[PDB]
Amino acid sequence: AKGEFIRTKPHVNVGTIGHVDHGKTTLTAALTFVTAAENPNVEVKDYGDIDKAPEERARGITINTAHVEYETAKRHYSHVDCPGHADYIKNMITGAAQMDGAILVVSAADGPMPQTREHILLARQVGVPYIVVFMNKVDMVDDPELLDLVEMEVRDLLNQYEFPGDEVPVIRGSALLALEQMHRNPKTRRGENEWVDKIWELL
RNA sequence: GGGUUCAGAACGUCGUGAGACAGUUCGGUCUCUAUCCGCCACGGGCGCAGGAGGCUUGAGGGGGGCUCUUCCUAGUACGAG
Ligand SMILES: Nc1nc2c(ncn2[C@@H]2O[C@H](COP(=O)(O)OP(=O)(O)CP(=O)(O)O)[C@@H](O)[C@H]2O)c(=O)[nH]1
Ligand SMILES: [Mg+2]
């Protein structure tokens, strides 16, 4: 009652970094629910069990790199979910020392923060060729052209440590909402619900 | 009436002694009846510029005024955390 792994598509490890409280984990649980419906072989994880360690849970934050499995009819992924803060950097650095690609995560409301830097810096010294940004917390105050300033300065940061910043695919949206509807929408593909389609732009 | 503050008894101690010490130590009677002012209640009498059965206004008095936890705004202002 464990089942044999059926290697169909190719496997690639992608991790998720970025400062604290910026949606790193939820965005992670999201990719689980999102990519779920449109294909089996995923096994759903939630904001709760993604961070099953007491305190990590009861206390609020993420303390240990997760490790999630979700695919696409295109490519199979293994998602290593790093923690924000400092202190635990010794656990993100270990999560990072793996992941082929890093799904960077910045927040519209806050913008690139102190850890956002170092993480990127570690990625340039860990050996994570390729980064993808994902502005989260966008569903905040109508910023006609403010969230645009983020993608202007975040790219400045990436192209500040030898990263294709100007090329880096900066998706936009919210993970909470995206998650939320999915949370109460198990089965349901893309090209339908608002935000859910914002996750796929990233996937 | 547990402490002190009578009489008994003892310790230490001081005194030849009787005795002595806010030094200890055990014991050791706390008084049915409220006249007046005061107070809580309750009436009788006369008064209210005509006699009565009812229902009332409220000057002025009194009473009562308290506080904690948790959830939501929101893990949002602020904060590297
Ligand atoms: N407004 C808004 N809030 C969101 C969004 N995504 C997440 N959040 C908020 O952040 C909370 C937890 O975020 P989480 O994903 O764990 O943050 P994190 O990136 O893991 C921070 P660390 O890993 O360092 O502990 C959520 O319960 C929610 O209130 C979003 O897209 N918009
Ligand atoms: Mg986390």
Q: Which residues surround ligand 2, an ion (CB under 5 A)?
A: A 24-25, 62
- Is A52 an annotated catalytic residue? no
**Residue A142 burial by CB count (10 A; 0-12/13-18/19+): exposed, middle or buried?**
exposed
Residues in contact with ligand 1 (CB, 6 Å cut-off): A 20-26, 61-62, 83-85, 136-137, 139, 174-176
| Degrees, nearest 5: CA angle A161-A167-A171 | 105
Helix A114-126, helix A146-158: angle, nearest 10 = 40
CA distance A160 to A128: 15
Given ligand 1 and candidates A16, A19, A25, A182, which is best to mutate, with the most ligand atoms within 8 Å of its CB? A25
- Smallest-distance ligand from the CA of A110: 1
Structure tokens at A36: 């779920």
Q: Which of A105, A111, A104 is nearest to A146 (CA)?
A: A111
Domains of chain A: 3-203 (3.40.50.300)
Starting at the edge strand that comes first in sequence, how are the strands of the sheet with A76-81 ordered?
Answer: A68-70, A76-81, A11-16, A101-103, A131-132
Q: Ligand 2 centre from A65 Cα, in Å?
A: 8
Q: What are phi and psi of A170, to 5 degrees?
A: -85, 85
Which nucleotide lies closest to A137 by the C1' atom and the CA atom? B76
Bases of chain B below 7 A from a protein C-beta are 75-77, 79-81
Strand B contact with A53 (CB < 7 A): no
What are the structure tokens assigned to A193, written together?
């619900």
Q: Please answer whether residues A17 and A105 qualify as being in contact, where contact means their C-beta atoms are separated by less than 8 angstroms.
A: yes
Residue A51 annotated as catalytic: no
How many angstroms is it from A90 CA to the middle of ligand 2?
A: 14
| DSSP string for chain A | --------SPEEEEEE--STTSSHHHHHHHHHHHHHHT-SS-----TTGGG-STTTTTT-S--S---EEE--SS-EEEEEE---SSSTHHHHHHHHTT-SEEE--EETTT-S-HHHHHHHHHHHHHT---EE-EEE--SSS--TTHHHHHHHHHHHHHTTTT--TTTS--EE--HHHHHHHHHT-SS--SSSSTTHHHHHTT-
If you search the block for the tokens 């998650």, which residue do you land on? A179
Query: Would you put residue A53 in left (φ > 0), alpha (ψ -120 to 50) or beta?
Result: beta
Spatial strand order of the sheet with A134-136 comes to A106-107, A134-136, A171-172
Resolution in A: 3.1
Q: Exposure string (b/e) for A160-196, b if CB count within 10 Å is 16 or more?
A: eeebebeebebbbbbbbbbbbbbeeeeeeebeeeebb
- Chain centroid to CA A100: how far? 14
